[PDB]
Design a protein around this ligand. Sequence first.
Ligand SMILES: [Zn+2]
Ligand SMILES: [Zn+2]
Ligand SMILES: [Zn+2]
Ligand SMILES: [Zn+2]
Lengths: 78, 77, 146, 146, 77, 77
Amino acid sequence: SHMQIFVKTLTGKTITLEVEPSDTIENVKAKIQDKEGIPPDQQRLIFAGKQLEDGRTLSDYNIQKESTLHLVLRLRGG
Amino acid sequence: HMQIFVKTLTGKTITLEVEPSDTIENVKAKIQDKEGIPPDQQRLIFAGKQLEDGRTLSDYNIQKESTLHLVLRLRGG
Amino acid sequence: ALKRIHKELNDLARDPPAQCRAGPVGDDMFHWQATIMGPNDSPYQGGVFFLTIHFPTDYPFKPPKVAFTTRIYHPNINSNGSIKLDILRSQWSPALTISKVLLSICSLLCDPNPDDPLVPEIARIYKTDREKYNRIAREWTQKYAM
Amino acid sequence: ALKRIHKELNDLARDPPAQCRAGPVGDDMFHWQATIMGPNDSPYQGGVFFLTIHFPTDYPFKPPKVAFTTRIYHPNINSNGSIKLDILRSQWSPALTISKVLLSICSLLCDPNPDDPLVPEIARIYKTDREKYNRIAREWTQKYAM
Amino acid sequence: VLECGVCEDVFSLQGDKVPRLLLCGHTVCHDCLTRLPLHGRAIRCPFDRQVTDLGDSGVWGLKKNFALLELLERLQN
Amino acid sequence: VLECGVCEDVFSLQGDKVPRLLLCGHTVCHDCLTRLPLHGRAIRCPFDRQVTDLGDSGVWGLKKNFALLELLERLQN
Ligand SMILES: [Zn+2]
Ligand SMILES: [Zn+2]
Ligand SMILES: [Zn+2]
Ligand SMILES: [Zn+2]
């Protein structure tokens, strides 16, 4: 129900997040904004080499306690 | 070239590199650089007396390792 | 409020400025007595003036009530010891400590504002005849503050 | 420039992300080789793709030149290994490290942009017939990256 | 550790005592900021009286001092 | 001590490595700030791409992180 995950921010420092399986990706990004001050629209979260889309939840990606997400900046292929 | 002290608003004591010829406004400029308070908001006290801009550290007989006290601009009414 | 009052007290006991001293009289943390030394090379030189300080409940976000208990001759200070000074009313800053306020009040002793006076007569003396102002201020200092 | 390149290297040796590896080939600090693992549950699953990195003299204030040396089937990556990606051009940030860039490139591997493609044909396959796209990408992965 | 220049309490990593920034560059704890007198929709820095305008989010719209927070958290370990 | 998130050098209390603030609340060393691309009197924060407009003073107009500087000087002593 209540778990902790890790996020590797842009500077390389590792932060800990208090989350729930039901939390959406945008809620996670909101927590990232609270701790690091980066707007969600500028955040791109990666898990297992794959981008995490906003609409889905941590359960949808089977993200479990003490998993580590990687934060990069929003990007566009062209 | 000498060093003096200034007790800032927060109470922390800072050291300033000054000369006898330096005016009070120049001292306040150094205070602004280190602490970020505009000179027009600074009021410097030495021996219980306000230090006026035009005068110099020599005029007030301020000597090395003396301590000035920083308060906020005020007005009697 | 109480925590900051204690911090200011610890600082005043450990390393106060040479010009002033302050501390709670009796057991009340919200009522202090203060002492100011008249600045040198001034009509108040050599004087010792006492003051009362009363801290509001939400100090430091409201200013303290400061009043002179020693009679003093000044345009901006009346016979009852009331001080009309902007940092005690609408120009107060929560970062100002009692020590800063007392130093401020000394600098006011030697730098009065006759244009907007609390005691009009004293201000008239100050503007018209400064020698007389200094004489009377020195007399008051000797009689009441020594 | 060199100090930060060394910092990124120390970080990559001590605690690299599970997905990628990078380091200077030979003695040249400004020319690196990189390795990316194809993400799981994707046509590139099980693949190992190599890349070249060239650091400009005023890195990190100018982006690095990153190119695939392993042939890969992707709309935004061409046969010469060039990557059309905005963070390598006008959306570069001096705070981005090589590790972050490589993770970015993986996330691009599984989330292409067919609307504005570097290889129009591959994009046509991706939009019209996804099954064929996945088949061809898997074949390319087996032949060239295994 | 570092304390707030107003209440002189210790800064916390989150909550009522989190260090927030004013436009003048000075830092004040969240709680003290909420208790400062509101000049229309602006507050005055206690150290220089410089004005910071507040938005609809009020004190929560003021940015945290992220660098200070990183250093403090490092000191915690 | 604490390092700059771009060059990853240690912050200095003054000079080319002094910590300065952007409107987003993040801190960057003076020298790195001078090297950021300037698009019409504006720079983008490296951590969030948010814009800070520069005045006549340029990068020197960006406020120092005074609280961080106080903590760093405390650690130095
Ligand atoms: Zn506070
Ligand atoms: Zn300020
Ligand atoms: Zn920023
Ligand atoms: Zn830097």
